[PDB]
Amino acid sequence: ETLWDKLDHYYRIVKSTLLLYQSPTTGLFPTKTCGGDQKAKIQDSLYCAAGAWALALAYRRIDDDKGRTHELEHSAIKCMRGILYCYMRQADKVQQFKQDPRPTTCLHSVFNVHTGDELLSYEEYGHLQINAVSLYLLYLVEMISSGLQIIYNTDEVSFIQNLVFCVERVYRVPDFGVWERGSKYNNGSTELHSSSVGLAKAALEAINGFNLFGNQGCSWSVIFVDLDAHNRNRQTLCSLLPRESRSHNTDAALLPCISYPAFALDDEVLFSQTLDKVVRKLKGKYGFKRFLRDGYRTSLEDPNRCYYKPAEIKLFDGIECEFPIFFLYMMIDGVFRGNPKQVQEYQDLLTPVLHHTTEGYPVVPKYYYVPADFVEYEKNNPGSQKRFPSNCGRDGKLFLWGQALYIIAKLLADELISPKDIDPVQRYVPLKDQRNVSMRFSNQGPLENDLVVHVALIAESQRLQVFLNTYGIQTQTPQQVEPIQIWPQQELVKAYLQLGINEKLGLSGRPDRPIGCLGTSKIYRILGKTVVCYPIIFDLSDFYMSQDVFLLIDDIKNALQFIKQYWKMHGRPLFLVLIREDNIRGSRFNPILDMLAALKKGIIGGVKVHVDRLQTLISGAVVEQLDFLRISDTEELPEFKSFEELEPGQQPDVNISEWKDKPTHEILQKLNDCSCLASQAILLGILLKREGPNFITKEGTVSDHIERVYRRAGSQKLWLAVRYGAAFTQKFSSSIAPHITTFLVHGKQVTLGAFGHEEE
Amino acid sequence: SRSNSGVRLDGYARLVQQTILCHQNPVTGLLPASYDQKDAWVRDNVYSILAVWGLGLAYRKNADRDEDKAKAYELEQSVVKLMRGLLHCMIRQVDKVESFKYSQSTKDSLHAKYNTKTCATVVGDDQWGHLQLDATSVYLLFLAQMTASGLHSLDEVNFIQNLVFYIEAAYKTADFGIWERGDKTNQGISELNASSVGMAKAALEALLADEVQHCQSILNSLLPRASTSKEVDASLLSVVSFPAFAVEDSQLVELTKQEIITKLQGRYGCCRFLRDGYKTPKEDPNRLYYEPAELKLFENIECEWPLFWTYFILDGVFSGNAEQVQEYKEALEAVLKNGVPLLPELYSVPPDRVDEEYQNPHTVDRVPMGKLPHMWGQSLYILGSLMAEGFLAPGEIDPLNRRFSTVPKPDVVVQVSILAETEEIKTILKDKGIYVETIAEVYPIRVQPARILSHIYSSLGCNNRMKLSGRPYRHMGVLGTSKLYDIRKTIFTFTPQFIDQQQFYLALDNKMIVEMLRTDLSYLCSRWRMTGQPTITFPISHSMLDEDGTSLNSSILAALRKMQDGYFGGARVQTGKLSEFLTTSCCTHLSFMDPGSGEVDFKALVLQLKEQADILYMLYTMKGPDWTELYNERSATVRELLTELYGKVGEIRHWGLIRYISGILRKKVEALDEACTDLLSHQKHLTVGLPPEPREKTISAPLPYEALTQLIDEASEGDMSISILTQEIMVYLAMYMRTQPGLFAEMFRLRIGLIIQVMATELAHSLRCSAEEATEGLMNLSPSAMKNLLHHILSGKEFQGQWQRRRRLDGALNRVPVGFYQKVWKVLQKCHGLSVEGFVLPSSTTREMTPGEIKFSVHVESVLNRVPQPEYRQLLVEAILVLTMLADIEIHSIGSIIAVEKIVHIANDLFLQEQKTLGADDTMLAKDPASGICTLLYDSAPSGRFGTMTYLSKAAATYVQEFLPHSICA
Ligand SMILES: Nc1ncnc2c1ncn2[C@@H]1O[C@H](COP(=O)(O)OP(=O)(O)O)[C@@H](O)[C@H]1O
Ligand SMILES: C/C=C(\C)CC/C=C(\C)CCC=C(C)C
């Protein structure tokens, strides 16, 4: 057989069983091949466009395609510039979702195939499926990489960026998932799914730095991911990884993630721990159960009731529908991972379950259900009964997602397309090649982690540089690095606020959050100047924790250890240890000098460091060019401020209880007789309540005297006062919320509240 | 390139971004018309992206660095995005494309406006007059051009070909126009605009040539006039010049441009058309329509649109020029925002200054209103600037070489293959010297009738997924059935339409076939503008042989021998084997065809039939109407022997009988809707019966074959043997307009009944006989002999009574003098109207008809040319022109509607008195039994002291004497 004949076989199957159904208008493919349903699901269209693109990737190996490469590729662009249209019309929702990711602010995931309009509402359907926004972005990168031009103007690039700002914060947005129901229980509940976070980690790894314009592209067409938000997704997937979610210890949606298309997991032991549970607990003769205790189109499921009631989930144990598609994903995984006998084992399993249409074209039935009469026999001896197909194709019903995966798997298995061809962005990294892949693997490899962070000791003043030199540490004042500009992280957050700003689509820009230690560890070219950012550890704060130098030295060690464990980008990380004259004041000098000295020795906390001059450290380094700032509306470039040289009691005697029963101006009396900054905080804190925010004090507004006592005992290191002060003035740290997410990303749950009192 | 050409390119980039690309919707790619008009017009979107496409082309011809590649890619993909958005706008209306494909109704047309945020529809079908063939045609044209420039599913290809079928019948489809208001009167009346026809022709040429050359016929006939109700439209620049270039006549293009400049061009642009009143201070802003009496008000104060001067820079760039006067005159640009030109939509005479502008035309300082910037005009302004400053070339915007239309195209040599149907026929052809090949020998080339070709195209364009059903069955003329076709790897050649149509008497006459072949060759030699050389397959059938069968028809031999000699039909012809013509033919490939009295009891009255064959037939109408497909009681029915009678009289070729049998059996010409559509295609109206007015039902617009045929039948009022004459004469007029259209000049309303009557009169005076026996011998004429009579009727060739014959010939042909209609416009200014036979042509018509309209012509020809008698009419024509003659010398105006007939008669009564006295027989001059006008008055020459026109001058002067008591003549 010639290649033309070998691939005309797939073009007949693709054209009859997939591209016939593509909407002439939207480009999206319909979920129901035959019928009046107008639903086009987002995920199924992406898998359908990928199937046409896989045939184009095959027809690229024939020069006389007879037009079939342009049509099959341009069908894929049609579907992908149709999902973009559906999303671009709902960009009022992309702005709302960046700011408040929630089940009822999401981009809809089911649209009218004919018109692109919203079909089912938030009540009717769970539209929060971030597997879909995330696979749109993985497929847009994988298709634009192939040569397929899907993004056409700067406004489409700004929407893809705003789509990225949404896909970054997936770790904190629980969703419904590929299966649209949430958990095994259809309680209408969203949960974090390794599958949705895993596809987001993959879209973000693929789209960071990607010209959406392809070869015909410049700096102003690149998408920029947050290295810190991507880390938070990597941390979440890893914490939850052998499993899918609180509810599912295994789901077959993990197979699309762990392997084609995302190829997300970067641990070979977790991939095997995740795949083995999926194959062992979910494989079947007719396919893979989506999840154990699944009621989809089961004989025992009630058709009328949308939501399974508690303990119903037991009735579906052994009756679970088995989806033949998962056999096709396992065959694609085998072609990618070089197992020529996992392709055969699962090809052999699919040849029997595959129906054929009247013209002989293969139909992959969506699910194989146990017929109602045989449910008890299967439950008694699972794997014994014969399950009827869900779609036979002759019925007029075809699973368009499965039809597309047959084309991808059959082409990959027959070697008519290559693993490299369908993963232009290299999502699968073979083990031997897991070395220098950005955001995933570092030169050292997959297992070794002795990163040398490139420290640069920057001193607030020349006075402090000369003082630090006398005591042994060469530091550089902000001016001595003249072309390089040292910026607070907040000044990068201001610059990023101009990324993705489209006023035509109502989009605003990066949400105003803190850039963290994996984004302040990068050298940036912003408006023609080189900007290096001091870490957020060095940012001044109202909270009293800042005063302890030992906590600063520990936050410096803690940050460098995070940079070591989680920085997998090409350059060496750049940590700038800003030293402020307050840091060396008093006996803080001895602790700071030991940190600064260890940074000079090359090790602080097990993290090897190379202190050196910023000019030498920034020299051949990769610089992220922030080209989105431009001039934009204002004919002036934005105004960015950069760090500049700052040129020159034993116990409180007053107990709260015995001194609060008094309402007296006498609390204002002891206030004049309390030298304790803890008695003052207790006495001048009873009054922030009973007399008011401004009840006049001898000193002035009470709000000013507690902030004076809090600040004063903060310096005098009088910690009972600093804590009565912080509390009385109700002080909260910016970091409480960022840290409470470490607990959550790691599968832990924090309870705040005292012991013996109301917990939350 | 960045030294001094990249900076200016960036300046134009800012221009396009801040005028056009700023308003492009990121979701749909469409462009809203303005802030107030948030909807996206198809034509405005297509035109507004031309600047972006040109900038992308500019950027690319100099794209070497990345950044420049990024800008070029962004511009090209913005153009692609806009066109795709317009596609999904049309794709969502596939049910309308499919419906308009067969039934070209305004209620089944693609919408002009679309929601710029969802590619959906904003208003209802009833709410905007959406039928605009120019918008869809300009979209198709620029889709073809952009693709030929490198700008990139099959389902949308099928949709695009269905759109090709949609705009395919635009030469005969009424339109709402480029200005989406139909006719000028502005009552939502769909009208045929040459702008739409030219744009459709350009789109079809860029993307079946038969309807293309039909559109070409519409363009030639209509230009320099725009449509029926428009003397000239400034939108014609979009046809005679960029972007369509649909007129290949350089003289016609120059004449259209000169008409636009002379009539519409003003100090602030060109008015769209005379008496437009789109944004004039005289209209009612909140009233959608226009009363017919306020169109005068709009005269000399129409809004001048700067958009049309962008067309005058574009031509001038496309055709090299010092029309750098059109530029430098566009200093009338709004802002010099920052300094952005912001080309306005129109300039309106300030309201106070209406009287000054009316009186002194193109002189008042108008104000800018409407859209600002006019993105359709702004894009053309930027494109013209780009092209004029050397950053762009005509060959980049026009990669299909549409600009080379005007160049004279050489005569084409039509290769003809004469093919023998049978081998015996081949033997006869050889004895006589024409060496041919049989249809069997021409294998593997398969010869098929043109019906099969028309049916094959019905399978082109079909996707049942989106409910698109091929192409409607359209008759393929000589142009379509002259290319060779590659269907399933075997070459198929198709004989012309006129050969397989053997259902009417025309095919029995071999001379007719010769004449049809000659007309087809003449049409081919002029209208073939296709790659390849056209190939007419001419098989000689057994019916083409003589009576004996051992010899071929003389006429057919003579035609074949002339074709062998290289010339026949005004065309150079090369005859040869069809196998030789493969390498130099338009071998198009059809890839869609690949698989994958007393005694009223009529018991015994037909017994008399059981040999004159005339009488046998005569009885047969008594037995048809009284008794058509009913029984005869001898294993026979009325229709059967009438068909047997028809065959018998065809064998004996006694043509009177064939015609009668055909007439009572209701034989109808299949390609008769084609004949009527061709005659109306040349801006000629048709009327179908005997001349008194109600019977003579006029044909102002094309009619479907069923209606046309039904109109013919009711126009005979049951009087047989004219209903067939109407079809036969219509066919002959169509052939003569295809071949010798000069013969049809100064003719605008073909009266078939009057034509038939004048042919009878000519057969009465030539071969002198009674007018009646001549009316019967007209039946017995061969179809080719009757066509010859018609030729001689038209050209006035002859095989003291002459002047009556001429007056008759010209009146029956409805021939008007050159400039007659404009002269009638002039008298209507003086008088209150003309009255012919009691029907009034009011002066109020001029208040809504500019003099050169072909809608005022029709108004005049419906009040004047309706006169039954052929001559009375030609006299009424004189009395109008002598009224026109004397209106100039007369210095005053009269408040009467002048009855022209009276002037004709007063001249009649003045003809008795003068001739009697000069001394002539009282019986020498006798009155007409129809008109009451002396026969000798008709026989009188026009000029002279006793000329008929002199008598009307002595009559009109004696007619307006009581109306105009005093006449201070010049
Ligand atoms: N004040 C802070 N202290 C510590 N880490 C912070 C602080 N602010 C932000 N971060 C870190 O910066 C990254 C991104 O910031 P942000 O969007 O605020 O994170 P999150 O949404 O997890 O709270 C996270 O890794 C977060 O933990
Ligand atoms: C000066 C008088 C004549 C030359 C006699 C003929 C002219 C008329 C009878 C009136 C013409 C004026 C019109 C408005 C028709």
Q: In sequence order, what DSSP letters do the residues of B353-388 get, joined into one string?
A: THHHHHHSSS-S-PEEES-SS-HHHHHHHHHHHHHH
A734 lines ligand 1 (CB under 6 A): yes
Give the list of residues 6+ apart from residue B499 with CB closer than 8 angstroms, or none: B449, B450, B507, B513, B538, B539, B541
Q: Which of A22, A153, A504 is the closest to B81 by Cβ?
A: A153
Q: C-alpha angle with apex B288: B284 to B290, nearest 5 degrees?
A: 70
Alpha carbons A258 and A330: distance in angstroms, whole number: 11
| Contacting residues of B for A215, CB less than 8 Å apart | 69
Smallest CA separation from ligand 2 atom 5, residue:
B957
| Pair A603, A609: CB distance under 8 Å | yes
Rg, C-alpha atoms of chain A: 30
> Does residue B155 sit at the A interface (CB-CB below 8 Å)?
yes
Ligand 2 pocket, residue B897 CB under 6 Å: no
B-chain residue closest to A26, CA distance: B88
Strands B113-114 and B346-348: unpaired
Please indicate whether, in this complex, the C-beta atoms of B465 and A220 are within 8 angstroms of each other: no
User: Which are the contacts of B751, defined by CB distance < 8 A and separation ≥ 6?
Assistant: B687, B691, B696, B812, B814, B865
State residue B49 phi and psi, 5-degree precision: -90, -5
Identify residue B156 by its one-letter amino acid code.
Answer: E
Does the C-beta of A541 come closer than 6 Å to ligand 1? no
Question: Is some CB atom of chain A closer than 8 A to the CB atom of B64?
Answer: no
Cα separation, A670 vs A685, in Å, equals 13
Task: Record the tokens describing residue B513, joined without a space.
Answer: 């076939």
Q: How far apart are CA B564 and CA B574, in angstroms?
A: 7
Is the Cβ pair B465, A154 closer than 8 Å?
A: no
Q: Does A74 sit within 8 Å of B24, measured CB to CB?
A: no
Which residues of chain A does B29 touch, with a Cβ-Cβ cutoff of 8 Å?
A: 152
Q: For residue A599, which of A622, A617, A626 has the smallest C-alpha distance?
A: A617
Other CB atoms within a 10 A radius of the CB of residue A57 amount to 28
The answer to whether B824 and B861 are in contact (CB under 8 A) is no
Alpha helices in B458-572 (DSSP H): 497-500, 510-527, 554-564
Residues A228 and A230: their CA atoms lie apart, in Å, by 5
Contacting B with CB below 8 Å, chain A residues are 12, 19-22, 24-26, 67, 70-71, 74-75, 78, 81, 85, 88-89, 91, 114-117, 149, 151-156, 158-159, 213, 215-221, 502, 504-505
Nearest protein CA to atom 19 of ligand 1, as residue: A738
State the Cα–Cα distance between residues B481 and A49, nearest whole angstrom: 42
Tell me if B223 sits within 8 A of B194, measured CB to CB. Answer: yes
Q: Which of A206, A211, A149 is nearest to A628 (CA)?
A: A211
Which of left, alpha, beta for B49 (phi over 0: left; psi -120 to 50: alpha)? alpha
Of A25, A91, A502, Cβ closest to residue B91: A25
Of the candidates B346, B387, B330, which has an alpha carbon nearest to the alpha carbon of residue B234? B346
Shortest CA gap A439–chain B (Å): 26
Task: Say if B26 is an interface residue toward chain A (CB within 8 Å).
Answer: yes
Which atom of ligand 1 lies closest to the CA of A226?
A: 14
| Interface contact flag, B69 A217, Cβ < 8 Å | yes
* Residue B118, CB-side half-sphere exposure with 13 Å CA sphere: 12
Asked whether A543 lines ligand 1 (CB < 6 A), one says no
Tokens linked to B406: 């005007």
| Mutation target vs A (from B49, B76, B154, B337; most A CBs, 10 A cutoff) | B154
Q: Alpha-carbon distance B72 to B63, whole Å?
A: 7
Q: From the CB of residue B259, how many other CB atoms can be counted at a distance below 10 Å?
A: 20
**Chain A CB contacts of B16 below 8 Å:** none
Q: Is A525 in the pocket of ligand 1 (CB under 6 A)?
A: no
How far, in Å, CA of B243 to CA of B825, rounded?
A: 35
Q: Which of A122, A155, A179 minimizes the C-alpha distance to A502? A: A155
Residues of A with CB below 8 A from B24's CB? 153, 155, 504
Q: Which pairs count as long-range contacts for B899-902, CB under 8 Å and 24+ apart, including other chains?
A: B899/B834, B899/B835, B899/B836, B900/B834, B900/B835, B900/B836, B900/B864, B900/B876, B901/B835, B901/B836, B901/B837, B901/B876, B902/B955, B902/B959
At B74 the three-state DSSP class reads helix
CB neighbour list of residue A568: distance below 8 Å, 6 or more residues apart: A437, A438, A439, A440, A441, A442
B24 touches chain A (CB under 8 A): yes
B338 at interface of A, judged by CB pairs closer than 8 A: no
A205 Cβ partners below 8 Å, 6+ apart? A225, A230, A427, A438, A439, A440
* H/E run at residue A486: strand A484-487
Ligand at minimal distance from the CA of A227 is 1
- Cβ(A514) – ligand 1 distance below 6 Å: yes
CB pairs under 8 A between A and B: 94
- What does B385-417 look like in DSSP terms, one character per residue? HHHHTTS--HHHH-TT-GGGGSSPPPPPEEEEE
H/E stretch holding A458 reads: strand A452-459
First to last CA, chain B: 72
CA distance B663 to B89: 51
- The two tokens of residue B509 are 């006459």
What is residue B549's DSSP assignment? S
Nearest to B801 by CA among B921, B924, B912: B924
Q: Whose CA is nearest to atom 7 of ligand 1?
A: A735
CB contact under 8 Å between B77 and A149, yes or no, is: yes
Cβ atoms A740, A695 nearer than 8 A:
no
Of B73, B153, B159, nearest to A217 by CB-CB distance is B73
In the block, which residue shows the tokens 């009167």? B185
B70 and A221 within 8 Å at the Cβ level: the answer is: yes
**Per this entry, what is the length of chain A?**
760
CB A169 within 8 A of CB A99: no
DSSP-assigned letter for residue B303: P
Q: Can you tell me which atom of ligand 2 is nearest the CA of B831?
A: 14
Cβ-based contacts of A116 with chain B (< 8 Å):
118-119
Q: Which two tokens stand for residue B639?
A: 């229709």
Ligand nearest to the CA of B962: 2
Does B889 sit in the ligand 2 pocket, CB within 6 Å? yes
Alpha carbon distances (Å) from B667 to A36, A238, B663, B713: 48, 87, 6, 11
Using alpha carbons, list the distances in angstroms from residue A580 to A487, A577, A584, B216, B948.
Answer: 15, 10, 7, 85, 119
The arrangement of strands across the sheet holding A523-526 comes to A484-487, A529-533, A523-526, A623-626
CB of A519 within 6 A of ligand 1: the answer is no
Taking the C-alpha atoms of residue B84 and residue B91, their distance in angstroms, rounded to an integer, is 10
For ligand 1, whether the C-beta of A283 sits within 6 Å is no
Q: What is the largest CA-CA distance in chain B?
A: 107
Output b/e per residue, B688-721; b: 16+ Cβ within 10 A: bbbbebebbebbebbbebeebbebbeebbeeeeb
Q: Which residues of A touch B94 (CB under 8 A)?
A: 24
| Sign, Cα dihedral of B112, B113, B117, B120 | negative
- Ligand 1 atom closest to the CA of A229, numbered from 1: 14
Task: Verify whether the Cβ–Cβ distance B26 to A24 is below 8 Å.
Answer: no
Interface check for B38 against chain A (CB to CB < 8 A): the answer is: no
For residue B416, list its beta bridge partners: B536, B575
Measure B809 CA to ligand 2 centroid, in angstroms.
29
Virtual CA dihedral for A322, A325, A328, A329, nearest 10 degrees? -100
Backbone angles phi, psi at B751, to 5 degrees: -95, 105
Nominal resolution (angstroms): 2.9
Place of tokens 């210890």: A249
Residues near A512 by beta carbon (within 8 Å), at least 6 away in sequence: A493, A497
Residues of B in contact with A159 (CB under 8 A): 26
Q: Do the beta carbons of residue B171 and residue B124 sit within 8 Å?
A: no
Which residues, 6+ apart, have CB-to-CB distance to B567 below 8 Å? B573
Ligand 2: residue of B823, B878, B890 to mutate (most ligand atoms within 8 A of CB) is B890
The backbone torsions φ and ψ at residue B292, rounded to the nearest 5 degrees and listed phi first, read: -65, -15
Which residues are registered as beta bridge partners of A574? A454
Instruction: Answer for the pair B676, B686: CB distance below 8 angstroms, yes or no.
Output: yes
Strands A368-369 and A529-533, how do they pair? unpaired
Torsion, CA B788, CA B789, CA B790, CA B796, rounded to 10: 110
Nearest to B466 among A24, A26, A159 (CB): A24
3-state secondary structure B676-711: HHHHHHCCCEEECCCCCCCCCCEECCCCCHHHHHHH
Pocket test for ligand 2, best of B896, B967, B968 (most atoms within 8 A of CB): B967
- What tokens were used for B487? 């269907």
By CA distance, what is B28's nearest residue in A?
Answer: A85
Q: For chain B, how big is the Rg over CA atoms in Å? A: 32
Residues of B in contact with A70 (CB under 8 A): 152
> Rounded to an integer, what is the distance from CA B725 to the centroid of its chain?
23
